[PDB]
Design a protein around this ligand. Structure first.
Ligand SMILES: [Mg+2]
Ligand SMILES: [Mg+2]
Ligand SMILES: [Mg+2]
Ligand SMILES: [Mg+2]
Ligand SMILES: [Mg+2]
Ligand SMILES: [Mg+2]
Ligand SMILES: [Mg+2]
Ligand SMILES: [Mg+2]
Ligand SMILES: [Mg+2]
Ligand SMILES: [Mg+2]
Ligand SMILES: [Mg+2]
Ligand SMILES: [Mg+2]
Ligand SMILES: [Mg+2]
Ligand SMILES: [Mg+2]
Ligand SMILES: [Mg+2]
Ligand SMILES: [Mg+2]
Ligand SMILES: [Mg+2]
Ligand SMILES: [Mg+2]
Ligand SMILES: [Mg+2]
Ligand SMILES: [Mg+2]
Ligand SMILES: [Mg+2]
Ligand SMILES: [Mg+2]
Ligand SMILES: [Mg+2]
Ligand SMILES: [Mg+2]
Ligand SMILES: [Mg+2]
Ligand SMILES: [Mg+2]
Ligand SMILES: [Mg+2]
Ligand SMILES: [Mg+2]
Ligand SMILES: [Mg+2]
Ligand SMILES: [Mg+2]
Ligand SMILES: [Mg+2]
Ligand SMILES: [Mg+2]
Ligand SMILES: [Mg+2]
Ligand SMILES: [Mg+2]
Ligand SMILES: [Mg+2]
Ligand SMILES: [Mg+2]
Ligand SMILES: [Mg+2]
Ligand SMILES: [Mg+2]
Ligand SMILES: [Mg+2]
Ligand SMILES: [Mg+2]
Ligand SMILES: [Mg+2]
Ligand SMILES: [Mg+2]
Ligand SMILES: [Mg+2]
Ligand SMILES: [Mg+2]
Ligand SMILES: [Mg+2]
Ligand SMILES: [Mg+2]
Ligand SMILES: [Mg+2]
Ligand SMILES: [Mg+2]
Ligand SMILES: [Mg+2]
Ligand SMILES: [Mg+2]
Ligand SMILES: [Mg+2]
Ligand SMILES: [Mg+2]
Ligand SMILES: [Mg+2]
Ligand SMILES: [Mg+2]
Ligand SMILES: [Mg+2]
Ligand SMILES: [Mg+2]
Ligand SMILES: [Mg+2]
Ligand SMILES: [Mg+2]
Ligand SMILES: [Mg+2]
Ligand SMILES: [Mg+2]
Ligand SMILES: [Mg+2]
Ligand SMILES: [Mg+2]
Ligand SMILES: [Mg+2]
Lengths: 46, 62, 27, 103, 77, 94
RNA sequence: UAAGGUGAUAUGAACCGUUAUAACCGGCGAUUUCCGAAUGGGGAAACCCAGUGUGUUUCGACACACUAUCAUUAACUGAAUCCAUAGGUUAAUGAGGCGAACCGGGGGAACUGAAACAUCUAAGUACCCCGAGGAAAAGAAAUCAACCGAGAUUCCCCCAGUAGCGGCGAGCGAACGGGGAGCAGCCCAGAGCCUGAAUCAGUGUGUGUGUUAGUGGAAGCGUCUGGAAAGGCGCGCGAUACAGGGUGACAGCCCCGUACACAAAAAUGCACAUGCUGUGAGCUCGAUGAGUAGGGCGGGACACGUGGUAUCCUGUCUGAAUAUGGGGGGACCAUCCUCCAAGGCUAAAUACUCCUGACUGACCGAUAGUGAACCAGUACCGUGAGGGAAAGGCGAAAAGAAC
RNA sequence: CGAAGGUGUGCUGUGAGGCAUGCUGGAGGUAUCAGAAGUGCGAAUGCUGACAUAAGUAACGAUAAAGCGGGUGAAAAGCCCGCUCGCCGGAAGACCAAGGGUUCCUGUCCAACGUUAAUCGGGGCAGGGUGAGUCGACCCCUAAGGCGAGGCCGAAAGGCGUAGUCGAUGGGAAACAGGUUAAUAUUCCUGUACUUGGUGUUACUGCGAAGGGGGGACGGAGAAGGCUAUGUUGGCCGGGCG
RNA sequence: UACGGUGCUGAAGCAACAAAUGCCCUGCUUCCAGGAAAAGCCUCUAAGCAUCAGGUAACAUCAAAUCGUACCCCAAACCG
């Protein structure tokens, strides 16, 4: 069957990437939460 | 050797730095092959290059 | 592996079960 | 500011060699010394073709705690604790007994 | 923004209270209007989004005093 | 003119290989491990100066580092850059 | 400061050093790739593409600097349009972003409780947003009191679960006054006179006290058991040091320390003192914060849910007197008392702990305690936000088993 | 001269319990009298870990199919070589994009993985391997759309959007054949080409844009005609005479 | 000949027919539902430049960087 994850790096980075997070206010709050939790991989972005 | 090198000119320090870098190249190719059996010379050279760049930043712009 | 056990529990229940298998409304 | 140093002759206070004497060969950073000829163990040395070792039961010296040794005072023939004083503006060691400077 | 440039009036929040005293949040907006004021000194018109209270204030203090206050406040006009 | 200090930091090591020995004996081409930011012109100037030999052309490629496991802990080696330096005919190098 | 070192797993190699530029520690410095506020333009973060200028060139081209936006200021320029203005351009200074809690403010729930529920409660809570500081805020009476008087603000204990509020239900809940911590008052709405006079700020210097490396630092032997003594049995000694930890079993006298005594080239904090810079001090005569107070309507805050409801705020419409005047004293009037709004500033006591140091625990001791004693916000899961583990101990010493 | 803990035994108390001791263990334990509690577990379709049961049962993943000889090896139904057989063949062949990210090749190993064995492997370990002026990207251009100086609006955050600037899935210069590596090739080599920028001479002389125009530049269906790829037959050459 | 390979040499290398869903064809015919943009490219001049700059023409010379390129890709390597 066709499953729900059909990957595309371009769409992955445009949707969930670093600059998409840094663009908006709420996306910047996400990176503050992940730095506070101490995430190694802060985003998708390689 | 900072005391010895302080009593030198800018052009003399640039000459020494260029001779150090040629020695560093010849050591790096020698250790690339199995010829180099004195591994400490790479460290001695890397420090002496740092001393020359340091004294150059002291004499110039300071 | 209890992490491969995490899979086990996390989604051998998230498989969700299909359902009762007798078309019976005891109605 | 170390009391027991490298070339010092010490006596052994505790252990299976309580009373023996020897020279320090090297002091270790872990607070241990290797005294020449005392704490002997028999290591089963594995042969190496490189390095040309046939491999056998080599008897060699093990480290020991500095607390377990003391500097032998050859004058008294005993162990003395070590103090520090300044002579000529230079920190020297001396025996706590007889206040004599360790040389 | 519903802000009088002169008085600094601003939409405040309150309640609609019903007969049964049912409270719903509402807003109280100022009566803002854009008006061209003839400044005789600069010999020109200046448009201000101003409430009617502010128009009574300009009619009382004078427009030169008010534009002095807006410059001392640091507000463009 | 590329500065001599950069030209001294460009070349890292020769790369020994069966393909390198073949290219050295047939096409008269040496194979070098170079600095990663080094370009072809920087390489051609370095070989033409530090080895005193005439370079015809330089072909480059980037080597991706392998993923290794020291014990059970994962790790990744560094990406490095490789240069096929074609010498002119008659020129020789150790 | 030093006789030993070249961080760890983790040996080894090749070396350095031993009386002082080995190493190590601290202070001041230097370098400080790329992304990221990211700031030369762009961008799917760690990438792409430039411009101008100054230099070099073996003419192939190299190197360096600058170039964001906004605010404010200054200069120059400059439309419709004559002047002008808008606009443009340069330059200078500043900001921008992150961050635990505390703080002030703008907005602002519901579950729930009421044994249902709508007023009410939860609750101005959670949450979102803005801004600041080491604290903030408030603050020097248009206050309380009661005909006696007190004398800014903030915090604590009482008053008091009282008075009251309230589908007078559930529930909410003061104040006056008293005891304490801490205490500090000032300026402009304006002229003069005397002139630099108080105080504050900055910047130097000097002194003191810290901090950022450190130094010295007491006094035990014998014997028995035992693998090993620090234990037992004898006999001594120290103590302004019997805090603690380690050492082959439980050590005041083995080691590190501790008590105590000191120590800083350099940087820096806090005090004083003083120099310089700026700042004005005091006296007299005045003046005394208008679309404001108050009012009408609608809301909100005060313990006070519009009630008989004072007082405070204001979205809207209005609208005074102004020292012979006005406000308040819980509807309201009269008398009396008290205070002077519509401009500001202000320490302390108070709140908190991302972080550092010391110490403590009738706190835990590996299914506990942080999620995490261990390479844990990891592995892993999820598109993503996000979720989120398990897993400690040979022995005194690897002497980690040659053959 | 052997603590706690573990395992037995004996004794004892009305009970919760207590005492002594053997073995293990190899370093802590604690009377009494008071004090404080994370103070007593069999159940909560309780939580975590371990071990059972069914049970050496079902199954071992397309009914495309295997057989033999030889080799290696401790060992061969499964590996290698070989002869046969069978299966796909508009695919079960070949080339790519997306995506993955070293799975590629060579050597060596067989503990684990592989639904069996394994000498094998996309498995473990070590080493090696990806070569471009013409391919693609980058780059010039824009679409939908996004961002958006100023700006307009809005309690705040922020929303929209001008100039602009991003954004391909589309437009825009140019390389072919043969050979070769264990593994790369339109990238290396041989041969033969091509394109765009530069500087520099020589002749000639209207150059110039952020502007104007042209072009780029565009639909569906249908009908044939001309061709080629390619195939068949003949010829030709080499071999054969069963 | 390491039996894997490597080296040398090398014949013929034509014709007819059939023939695409590929090419001419971004064509032609026809229909209505009426079928992207911008740059490169060509050209025109504007201010400007006036014999300088620039332009095309030939020739010569130099440069063409950087990144990807292994391997699977209807699959045991992608999503399950
Ligand atoms: Mg409500
Ligand atoms: Mg080439
Ligand atoms: Mg390439
Ligand atoms: Mg080391
Ligand atoms: Mg940018
Ligand atoms: Mg930038
Ligand atoms: Mg751009
Ligand atoms: Mg409710
Ligand atoms: Mg209820
Ligand atoms: Mg304040
Ligand atoms: Mg009085
Ligand atoms: Mg000391
Ligand atoms: Mg001592
Ligand atoms: Mg000891
Ligand atoms: Mg023990
Ligand atoms: Mg007043
Ligand atoms: Mg009023
Ligand atoms: Mg009233
Ligand atoms: Mg009202
Ligand atoms: Mg009013
Ligand atoms: Mg009033
Ligand atoms: Mg009254
Ligand atoms: Mg006041
Ligand atoms: Mg735990
Ligand atoms: Mg345990
Ligand atoms: Mg993931
Ligand atoms: Mg026993
Ligand atoms: Mg216990
Ligand atoms: Mg027991
Ligand atoms: Mg026991
Ligand atoms: Mg006790
Ligand atoms: Mg319990
Ligand atoms: Mg139980
Ligand atoms: Mg029960
Ligand atoms: Mg149970
Ligand atoms: Mg069974
Ligand atoms: Mg059965
Ligand atoms: Mg059966
Ligand atoms: Mg069966
Ligand atoms: Mg099968
Ligand atoms: Mg067989
Ligand atoms: Mg088979
Ligand atoms: Mg076969
Ligand atoms: Mg078939
Ligand atoms: Mg692998
Ligand atoms: Mg393979
Ligand atoms: Mg292999
Ligand atoms: Mg086997
Ligand atoms: Mg198996
Ligand atoms: Mg493999
Ligand atoms: Mg392009
Ligand atoms: Mg657009
Ligand atoms: Mg927009
Ligand atoms: Mg804007
Ligand atoms: Mg673009
Ligand atoms: Mg495209
Ligand atoms: Mg291949
Ligand atoms: Mg055009
Ligand atoms: Mg069409
Ligand atoms: Mg043909
Ligand atoms: Mg026949
Ligand atoms: Mg390929
Ligand atoms: Mg296939």
């Amino acid at each position: 069957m066709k499953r729900t994850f059909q990957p595309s790096v371009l769409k992955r980075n445009r949707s969930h990437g670093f600059r998409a997070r840094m663009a908006t206010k709420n996306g910047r709050q996400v990176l503050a939460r992940r730095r506070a939790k101490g995430r190694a991989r802060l985003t998708v972005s390689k | 050797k900072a005391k010895e090198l302080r009593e030198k000119s800018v052009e003399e320090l640039n000459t020494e730095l260029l001779n150090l870098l040629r020695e560093q190249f010849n050591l790096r190719m020698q250790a690339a092959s199995g010829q180099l059996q004195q591994s400490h010379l790479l460290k001695q050279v890397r420090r002496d290059v740092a001393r020359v760049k340091t004294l150059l930043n002291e004499k110039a712009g300071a | 592996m209890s992490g491969k056990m995490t899979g086990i529990v996390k989604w051998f229940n998230a498989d969700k079960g299909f359902g009762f298998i007798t078309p019976d409304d005891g109605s | 500011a170390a009391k027991i140093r490298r070339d010092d002759e010490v006596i052994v206070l505790t252990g299976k060699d309580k009373g023996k004497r020897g020279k320090v060969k090297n002091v270790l950073s872990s607070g241990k010394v290797i005294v020449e000829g005392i704490n002997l163990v028999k290591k089963h040395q594995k042969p190496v073709p490189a390095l040309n070792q046939p491999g056998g039961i080599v008897e060699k010296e093990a480290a020991i705690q500095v607390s377990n040794v003391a500097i032998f005072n050859a004058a008294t023939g005993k162990a003395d604790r070590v103090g520090f004083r300044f002579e000529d503006g230079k920190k020297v060691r001396f025996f706590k007994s007889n206040s004599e400077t360790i040389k | 923004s519903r802000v009088c440039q002169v008085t600094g009036k601003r939409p405040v929040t309150g309640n609609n209270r019903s007969h049964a005293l049912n409270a719903t949040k509402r807003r109280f907006l100022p009566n803002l209007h854009s008006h061209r004021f003839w400044v005789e000194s600069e010999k020109r018109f200046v448009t201000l989004r101003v409430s009617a209270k502010g128009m009574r204030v300009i009619d009382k203090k004078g427009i030169d005093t008010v534009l002095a206050e807006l410059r001392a406040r640091g507000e463009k006009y | 003119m590329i500065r001599e200090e950069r030209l001294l930091k460009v070349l890292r090591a020769p790369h020994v290989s069966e393909k390198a020995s073949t290219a050295m004996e047939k096409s008269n081409t040496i194979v070098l491990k170079v600095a990663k930011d080094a370009t072809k012109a920087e390489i051609k100037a370095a070989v033409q100066k530090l080895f005193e030999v005439e370079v015809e052309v330089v072909n480059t490629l980037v080597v991706k580092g392998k993923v290794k496991r020291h014990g059970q802990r994962i790790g990744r080696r560094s990406d490095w850059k490789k240069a096929y330096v074609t010498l002119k005919e008659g020129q020789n190098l150790d």
